[PDB]
Amino acid sequence: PKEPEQLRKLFIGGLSFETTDESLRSHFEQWGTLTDCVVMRDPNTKRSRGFGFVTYATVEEVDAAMNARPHKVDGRVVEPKRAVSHLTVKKIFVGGIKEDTEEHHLRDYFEQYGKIEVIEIMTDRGSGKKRGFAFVTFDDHDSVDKIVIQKYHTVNGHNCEVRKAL
Template identity: 80%
Template sequence: MENTSNFLVMRDPNTKRSRGFGFVPYTTVEEVDATMNARPHKVGGRVVGPKRVSCGMEKSQRPGAPLTMKKVLVGGINEDTEEHHLRDYFEWYGKTEVIEIMTDRGSVKKRGFAFVTFDDHDSVDKIVIQKYHTVNGHNCEVRKALSKQERASASSSQRGRSGSGNFGGGRGGGFGSNDNFGSGGNFCGHGDFGG
């Protein structure tokens, strides 16, 4: 990032003052990886936190949403999927800290989804660039996992719109409500250097 001359600083449309973040375009994923691996970065003497973004940002990546999530929700896992299957797959993206396969209360019956927590938010950002992943031979949908408080906040700001903003359907319900969260798989080569 030292010699970057191509960037966009986001400004308030009324005051023209910086909003405290911007974007740096990259040509390849490898350039983004190199930037993320060389953290921390300084701009104007201040440490900045780079984050991956894609052109088709999902709703949990849009302004006002937390940008440094370390947990993903893996929906649509099969009954025979075990913790080691998830660990083997997701360790390619970064070091996993916790893997939780959700079960019915008071039972060992699996509910069809899991949470995977990483030691770094960049692992999550790399994963969600691609919406669908194949884990243990099954196609799964992966999204950033919002806390209950974040879901409630997002829900209140989304009132009147279709879709539930989560995997929908309640207990063991249908994954993929009528809210498609954008394209999710398009990498457009931007690194976000937010403040």
């Protein structure tokens, strides 16, 4: 029961024009089995378009590669990102938390996706009452990318709606 291929791909931007299918594969095979690895090139000149993609056998292998950033590939720091579900942001909206969800609930849950920098539990401008949603800001976009492709998020017993923010 393999994870969907779309969830096992990493788009690699910022490639050296010298990077090849073979050299990109040799690099990223350090973090797992690669079922696909392509450098995008011009159809007429064969000159590199400066980006490519690798497909791992499992999602855990994608995580391993992302946790090994920064990647310097053939002398150039590249920019890996998970495939589109790119709106590259570090902040999420968390809705459906009602009035009893506190900072530590959100922190304890979301800290396993990435390093948290800000947690903002929203309150009513007039009364101070909790409005039932929050924003979490991480230090890096991959946390958010992992979060928003999950079907479900359960925090403080609530089934929450989570999406990318601004």
